[model samples]
Target: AQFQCQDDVKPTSYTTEEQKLVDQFWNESLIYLDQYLKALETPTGQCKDSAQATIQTYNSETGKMQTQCIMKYRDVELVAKHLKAVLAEPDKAKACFDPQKNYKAFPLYTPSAHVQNLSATSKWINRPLLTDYYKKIGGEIGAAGLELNENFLEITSRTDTTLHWTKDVSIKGLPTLWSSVGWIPFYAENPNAGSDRFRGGYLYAEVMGPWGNLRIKEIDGEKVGAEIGMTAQLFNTSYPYHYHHPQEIYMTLTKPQCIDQNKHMVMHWDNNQFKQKRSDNGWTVNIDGSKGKWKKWFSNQDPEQNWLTYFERNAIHAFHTLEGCNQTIKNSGLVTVWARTTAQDNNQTTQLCRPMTGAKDIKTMKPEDKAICDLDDWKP
Candidate 1:
């Protein structure tokens, strides 16, 4: 079976609440756009012709601070012009909310020169090399600049991709055993093998706690992994139903929102049971395949309760597309950070296995598809 276009797969209607939110988003964004344009027209210290500003940014790789002067007016003007063109039509303005539809649009806020410079230096710019396995899975993968300290390691995704860092890196309260970090932008279609099609991006970092010593090594010159790791997964497309050997914790980072609606599905392996919840609130749950049922599954939509989850080894689970299914508004995908711990008996292998059914039906899967799910001993 061929992969359907996004519009075909995504739901076209919005609920009453979602409709109100979408309208608010559109109206407010337009207002802001007009305000920014007006501000640009008036001459201010930094907005005047040839006006520049001095900025300082830390170079994580070099362990030093860098200073530079960038033309503020020019940057703002460039971004404004692009936004004006892209949002000229109501349809285009609506599409701007979803990066997949308007992937080339600039960010609402004009990035400072330092931010622009970092994007240029990102390994994703040249496209990082991938292993034969990942290459078959079909998407982009790369390493971002990384920072490390005695207490912890930090990494961020590049702004050029659908998923990226919207805030500064802070490891203040996190676990202190991070060893490695990497980025992956899953494509909507498999390039080499058409059977493997998906969309999303994953920022994964390996954390080695008491189970092992902190170690960092380059895999295929592009990835980093430790005995255990945490991953920040953001996706606009429904991911395949799968399970893995590692015990995992899933924590929501933001109130999940859909482009057209606010509810999504979370499917489980046993009897294909599932649940629906409004995509809001931070929460956590423990899942264990061996245990045969989840320990806790609840969401109150409380901002205070966000950012926590737990899963036992081999817990089978998958994410259904957000109800409205349109690509999410910027930074509004079902973003979650997962902490995974390998079983002591599995030789530290975090192999993920997908059944040949549902979205990844065996009839549509190729030999390469089976290979990707079956061949991960973590050697590559």
Candidate 2:
């Protein structure tokens, strides 16, 4: 309660106790964003769900996950209209611009060079497509690049898998798909603004956008709805604008127990914010503060702990109703998380890629392996 007034004045930004410390810094950023939206929605007491077995994500790069109260997607939708035919494909005259298919679906081109059109009944004012957090994976950059294998021994290589919730797909041109994860309303007047390439926790990964053929289903409803189409390497005709737009984000796991097609999960470098003309750097690769610190004698322990990205959501999902698990559906195919926030497995690198993976790895979260904590292989 002492305010000399000037002297670099910042006592609650100047005082009356600064509107009660600006209502206690916006109620502590809305209570750490409402418990990061209840840890990503749906998981009651000790993480009930036929008794927690632990396993949140893997989708292969290697495979292994468990952090707690696992529920990868609870109330989801983003029925990929192939990014709405890639932003109405080169000016929809009848629309059709198959960059060998669909051009990866999405990934940066904003702040300039734009296009629009979303019909088929168009109305995502509802919403869907979201996450706990996962990072730098955008369409087939090695199929959503996921590798966290602990026992396999390849500790940390550009890590990211983040999403703390707030998505809302609001139904569109459908025979299927309605949405909600953390609140994604695109424009109920301005739904948080395009998430800067889809961000809550991490992996909005798109590889480079533009690709197509997607549809899948399993986990015994026996075959609720199927359209199975898979084939991508880059296909995005336009359909990504922002509250921060750029490109490249990735994630994929058609469910085979995550990923381990024979060890490869290793990466390092990301002080986050990589904009040398938009680049998540394929998901991990960064260094600075005055030039790459001489490559840390070309090794670890400070070259920023030799390479670690992010994780940490801890737990808080109180309602995922697939009603008996072993299922995945992002327009079916057992999970096709390309764009629209995603992550599971280390609460998405301690809530936002280990503090956006540097700037001292965000706020502070450490732990790369716990023998695959929790479990959410599509529920059950």
Candidate 3:
């Protein structure tokens, strides 16, 4: 049977280059599907059971490599049956090329630019509490905080948020699939619903490894009343100097290697103190002629270990990736978990103060730097 094309199945607006990339992925997928079907039919020893379920290929159209996880050895017979059914039903053949209908087999291409600007919004809002699996694994981390109350697990498990890297936010040499799970308060009355203002309790877990997990259960039986959040970042590219209002604690998850690795990973003004210089935009820290400190702040310890580099509110700091460290940074790159907090006052609903500049001033920064800054959950 001929492949039936559907006009409505295609995206409304797509460039010629994007269309070519999609076509290439489609052709490659068919080749894999046919191979898998043949392997299942012959039941040959050549079909290794250890073969990867997903494969990565370079896409010249987008100048980046893409991964496809559709075909698996265990699913060979199942997919073969689907292919046979499609041959008899012409309408069903559209599924072969429809990325939306068969996203697992035919993932679509999203522009890197669009990915950069995408908001870091929570996926599970007002959803039921996390499953017991997450609760058990997450509860252990929350219990490490001795300050928390007995019901810390119940408070933190109320909301689950998954944070991931998009095409635009992902750097070429960085870990593309790095993601984090955040347990935050999710209620309609929560003023910090969309912003970084977290209450009730907070727990962060890095799925790839256990080296970077943060937890703050509660304060005196009452959930923390402040703006708090955790961000797991892998900086393959250099970032400019900037400051924020919330007190930040940065824990490096990877070891140091680059020439200026010490400075690149954790370089900031000494004692979290900096002199502010008035600029046209607003108050800015002047790093010139200032005492700077740098060191390796790794976080590979017991869950309760507290070897963290604390940056007080408005502490000027910057991250820079030196030359020849691209592959080093990408492979065992600079993975870090940043925990930020702003104290709350007697008013239960408000933070003590907001940063002078709501967000990073993107106009003067590079495109990549701007994308990195946009990862902030709170604009103000």
Candidate 4:
């Protein structure tokens, strides 16, 4: 069957310049280049398997080019959608296509300039939680959060306040596809909900990866409190970044306090004190219910601290959201924090939770500060 873009733009009509551009894209694209070639050379159904399931395969010459049969239908589908966008918004699409202007891993153009500006870390009041929520594709869950040294920068901010622990948070950071969130608190929507419950809260930190964002959640049941979860990107999506497959891991909680007054979410790094810092046993997010240990699934990759490269240097973020009803906030204790340049620098570790300068829903909104009375979680 002939191909038609989603915007109803047919490739049957292409100028010589446009045709050259397509050829260039075909070579550069990991997914669509092969499809375009095959459609011109192969017979119907040759590239796709119909026996067990409809899986498309690639057989490159020399086999040196490609080792085995790689499934490419998903990639082709995305390519098709992108092609449609290019045809519909040629000016915007052409701008992104130009390497010097918008070149990188994901150069797809966003509609608004304010979209990127939303990542600004500043003081602000309560506004609608910035979410680019989308339904899970094909009902499938996968791994993410592996790449960041590519094309995006991290953005985060922090503030000190005596506010009680009930105001929800919806902070935005660097554009991430997958993340593993660290020490954060969330008011349970309904703890009685099952394993497939809605999870969100205030003191949230996202551990970003190339695959997907492994995150923190507040499940209000006998099982889940502030637990770790993996899902598609869950923040403002206007930034220029790429999305990868999803990743999931099982991290349980030991001391969780969702139904109580201890609404504290804390994170710490070993600061390389034991000399073995930044490994599987280097950092931690100590709360009540979580098992309290960050693990790695991507073994040969960089250190976990690499994910925080942008967070500290940029800003510290806190996000919260309330669902159903009874959205009013409650007992939000003063938030306290400790940060430094090195993980082991005691002089810098004593943090200063500065108040932000932008508007969230109102102006001059302040987050909580961690008290330095008795650091009970991580021992020296």
**Candidate 2 lDDT over residue span 1-380, tens digit each:** 11111122112223464344333322332232232233333343355641122222222233333323323322111212222222233132111111111122332110100101121111211221221111233332212222210100111111222322233111121111111111221211222212221221112211111121112121112211111111111111111111111111112222222221111111112212221222332222221212432211111111111111112122211101111221331211112222322221112222122122334322222122111112211212
Off by over 4 Å in 3: 1-232, 257-275, 278-284, 289-307, 327-329, 343-380
Best by lDDT: 1
Model 4 per-residue lDDT tens digits across residues 208-305: 11110111111111111111122111121111100111111111111112222111111212211111112252222211111322111001101110
Models ranked on TM-score: 1, 3, 2, 4
TM-score for each model = 0.35, 0.20, 0.30, 0.19
Cα-based lDDT for every prediction? 0.30, 0.20, 0.29, 0.20
| Candidate 2 Cα deviation (angstroms), residue 26 | 29
**What is the overall TM-score of model 3 with all chains considered together?**
0.30
The stretch of ten residues in a row with the least summed lDDT in candidate 1 is 143-152
- lDDT for model 2, please: 0.20
Give candidate 1 misplaced runs (Cα > 4 Å). 1-180, 184-200, 207-213, 216-234, 258-303, 325-331, 347-380
Better of 2 and 3 by lDDT: 3
Clashes of 3: 1
Better of 2 and 3 by TM-score: 3
Poorest 10 consecutive residues by lDDT, candidate 3 = 207-216
* Root-mean-square deviation (CA) per prediction: 23.3, 22.4, 23.0, 23.3
Per-residue lDDT for 138 in model 4? 12
Model 4 / residue 343 / CA error / Å: 42
